[model samples]
Target: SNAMLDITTITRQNVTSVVGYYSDAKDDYYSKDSSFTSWQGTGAEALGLSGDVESARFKELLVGEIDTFTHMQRHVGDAKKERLGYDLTFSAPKGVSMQALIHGDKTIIEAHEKAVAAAVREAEKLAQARTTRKSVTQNTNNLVVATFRHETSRALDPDLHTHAFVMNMTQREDGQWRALKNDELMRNKMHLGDVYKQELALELTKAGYELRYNSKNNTFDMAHFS
Candidate 1:
């Protein structure tokens, strides 16, 4: 079966609460540890951000502040804009999650992360932003994302997933920053999910794991395993 990807909008009204949910340790369903968070995407590089994601820095970017980046101050968007970003939760198949979380297979976990990276890269190619000239839109092909990898579900069960918070900003070819055209992203959510699953399946095969297709769920499971 394929992996699952759920998308939701992030707005100014709930941005703080969403960050709190991702950063807090109270809901540690597996290791009782805070989820690992990291920055990704070409848009992050433009902001001079890398490695671990910091709460303060993240909030600064969300509010359209210029100090966080190495570049000069320029118009990005309204700091009070209602829509801030999108929360994309990419979840692994049941068997893959069990192999990683229950069996503590680091290889499987690495494969999941690699697959996510590939999927996000593919999605970035479709990124777009509007221009001031007649409000025309153009391909920006960039995104600033903060990814938080979690190992359990709300019910405290093994459920491996990563929440990718894609900020509502992108860099135009003119080197100007603008709000992302999220409608394009939402349009291709299913394709992105399938991309993740296909990458993971390829990785599993290379690792000597045989996969059996499950037509009902449109996913793949480890062959001969109950």
Candidate 2:
């Protein structure tokens, strides 16, 4: 697959470690240039957050301090003991990564960012939360995500990817904050991955790149490259 999604549970026990790990520069790996960590999702707009991701606020959101925006407590009671959120890592295909890193094509990098954003938007449409009224679930159409773009793998080889930290909380239609129905997001992983690939392929084609279907891996690779 050209795009892959790896989901990991986030909790209070390891939230600090998660913050430290992704906030560090070590993950940037190969490229001397680093991409800025930014906040995405309509949920973020709902909370009045945007631009670059701040460590303090990011940690607060992950831990369910939903009042970070409004002084009024949006989420009541103690912090969540179970799953706090999910770390959704969306990886670009090897050839796409190489086109951005090895070839140093800024446009390709932009296209990758665009593709990831499109995929995340698609995922947000499925965002839902169980309501307190009757234990029924409803689409919230909101998801707060902090995205960190990395340029290489642990081996220091070019491998462009993005870490999308999806917060667990969502506001219901009744204006109540509750835990997300994350299973819905998990179930659509394959579809979301394809959305990323299809969007990237469209952007590349429009950029004048020729692509041939790599049936074995189920992805399109640049012609005469990789």
Candidate 3:
């Protein structure tokens, strides 16, 4: 799966701490708790979870921590904190200028994200199935997805990207919360990227940009980019 879509797993061991990860990222998508639902030009949304009102709950569920006094795990899924969440990133190829990717009030950008988001939705269903040990057709899989858009990478490069934080909470039909099956979600990640590329191709062509496929890198480059 040499696709442009990249999925990174966030774990307690990988990051400094569960709280630290949320603290660092919370501001990136929210200015206040109320900002969770207030979609700005940069864009953000929460699914299977309430908006700003859910600020405290969202972090508590995603970042299961240890008891400060006992030093024991405060969360039910203590050992599995490494499987806390997944970051599904959709990015444009380097040759594609930021303006072209997000021009016309982000006409093309949103379309492309719609495709990627759809795939993540499906993956959430699959993950929920495994978490509950239930049949695949059941409607028990519900996830809290926080979608955010970033204009640059850590190095301050001019890049356009969106991050879908698939939390490890699944609302069962019985109204109980459990950890997500990350394996199932990861398996579908490549297909998610494939879906994003298909939608991006359609959007780009409609926007009147000539595109050339790069077999070597397995990405697309626009004529204007050359």
Candidate 4:
């Protein structure tokens, strides 16, 4: 109600050729247009109705000429100019710090803008790392083990490396360790030296050691570290 001086009222009885509300905010509209996107009065990629609502004629409502109207009725959206000419530029002689004189205010504003922009950029980088890196390599400890079996059992005429084994040492609570580091200990524990060969091959694979053999018990084992 405060903004509505005459909400439903229309004034077509003025003593002028046309009676309509006008705004004197051309400079403000143009500045906002520059911030959102490049704007052209008449060209491709021109602002559409929605674009106008967002940038040009959407900030405030102008009920009458701002110079002669109250604040509520003086809010202007846009303006028009009949006179047009090439943009004017002026210079003071030649040797002068015109940049400092003319753009001092802009320089101060830009310095503040750069500070805020650096802070925002750092924050965005942190956000991206938390979101993207978490999915790829964060909290990673990957390892894989693979095994291959050779269907043929008989070794060729060359040297047959047909043995694979490891010593199993069990430790007792009394600080005594039952040790087995020789083939005799392994055959003594498992009763069958043939099966123990395969078990030894598997144990060697888990220890990350490779075996080069002419004939290695019809099975090969491998482990991957990641």
Candidate 5:
């Protein structure tokens, strides 16, 4: 099976473009008018944001108060392409029944949301440079994620996923803005994959669903998935 958790950088050039793609009114991006009968629009904290999500707010929240957006943190490179934000996507297994997703069952879907939030919050950390000029791990992490739930895959299949834009800036203990440690995010991704699966598995079992694990292809199959 595919990894359930992944993070990628959103550069300055791609920041506005990605937001446009998400809220494309003409394209019916969330499949409200295309494959699905109804659609919902909201963010992680606030709901009903729909088409009102402006690029300006996105930049301000992610890139901080800067005239020229540069890299989130200085790394060993000459490239000045600033990372505006990181996209943390949590997707359900392909074999999961489409009916379960389309209907938006409150019990199961809320479980999924809880699992995703925990995984991201648990993994949020920074590679702070010590005064000794060495990087060490501390609990310094703050993130404001603008989450968007997408209902279809690139092929327009019934693939449920959440595209969470985790803003790059985090607050230090003394109110200093810090960048998220990309290395730690990548390292902890597989563990987070386990977190998601375990959360879903527990919910599935509690809901009177049976599941089987296939070692051959590394996938889980619920009864309805078959």
Candidate 6:
């Protein structure tokens, strides 16, 4: 009788931040940490689960999540040794102040990162989720879908209620591009938010094109501005 638990929000899978940024442009940012928040230390990200994890989704998602944000795209700096402020600036002109957005504060990133790391595990255990090669060619529509799991509420066929994710995987000119996993991409962009904020920089990091993230839900899910 209790097979269905309609989770609305605030669960470990719940995203508190929009995971977006402002370019000193028309767009708005959700949360902005210290302008000097450098990812210098190669410290390992903590992916522990909280009691609120529903089960243990927090730890599963944290591993890849930390890597995603940690390895987004560091600015080109010749200095290899632990250097301070690696002469990095936004690719585009920054005329506005880097401020925080609605979803979270700079302090919450740790928690956010932990939450994402947890989801990574949760996605893998999902049974109803299907895994077929996504149509990543021009012959097919731009619509693309790749997710950790696909769950539905239908009684007979849970497959029918699968959530759809739109995406665009740009083909490389000379080589085959293996799209980075969802958690990896998201972790890079978030951890390296300062560097990957630019469209060009983000793409350069990818095999051919940069991945787009879903700030509302906090995950790598599409490619629009790129």
What are the models' TM-scores? 0.82, 0.82, 0.65, 0.17, 0.68, 0.17
Q: Tell me how many clashing residue pairs each candidate has.
A: 4, 0, 0, 2, 1, 25
Compute the lDDT of residue 80 as modeled in candidate 2. 47
Provide C-alpha RMSD values for all models, in order.
Answer: 4.8, 4.7, 6.4, 39.8, 6.4, 21.7
lDDT of 4 by residue, 1-226 (tens): 1110011211223212111122255543322433222211111122132222222222211122112232222112332311111110111111111221232323322322232222222222211111132443121111010001111112221111110111112122232222211222212322222233344444444444453332553433222210
- Report lDDT (Cα) of residue 222, candidate 1: 65
- Segments in model 5 whose C-alpha atoms lie over 4 Å from true places: 1-3, 17-56, 66-80, 102-104, 125-137, 153-156, 216-218
lDDT by residue for model 3 over 1-226, one digit each (tens)?
1236778777767644322244444554343553213211111232334443233444554564211332222255566455667767777655453443434336545555665566566655565533225544344556666656555522333465566666655554654455565666677766777777767777777877688887996767666552
TM-score-better candidate, 1 vs 4: 1
lDDT of 2 by residue, 1-226 (tens): 2347777788756766563244454533222244546778988888787777766677668767777553323244555456778877778777777777788878888888888899889989989987656667799998989887877733344688888888887777887667788888989888988888899889989998888788887888667555
For model 2, state the Cα shift of residue 140 in Å: 0.9
lDDT of each: 0.75, 0.75, 0.53, 0.21, 0.55, 0.23
Better of 2 and 6 by lDDT: 2
TM-score of 1: 0.82
- lDDT, model 1: 0.75
Show where candidate 6 strays beyond 4 Å.
1-22, 26-112, 121-175, 178-226
Q: Per-residue lDDT for 107 in model 1?
A: 86
Question: 1 or 5: which has the higher TM-score?
Answer: 1
Quote the positional error of residue 190 for candidate 6 in Å: 24
How close to the true structure is residue 80 of candidate 3, measured as C-alpha lDDT? 49
Give residue 220's lDDT in candidate 4 (0 to 100).
Answer: 30
Q: What does the lDDT read for residue 167 in candidate 6?
A: 19
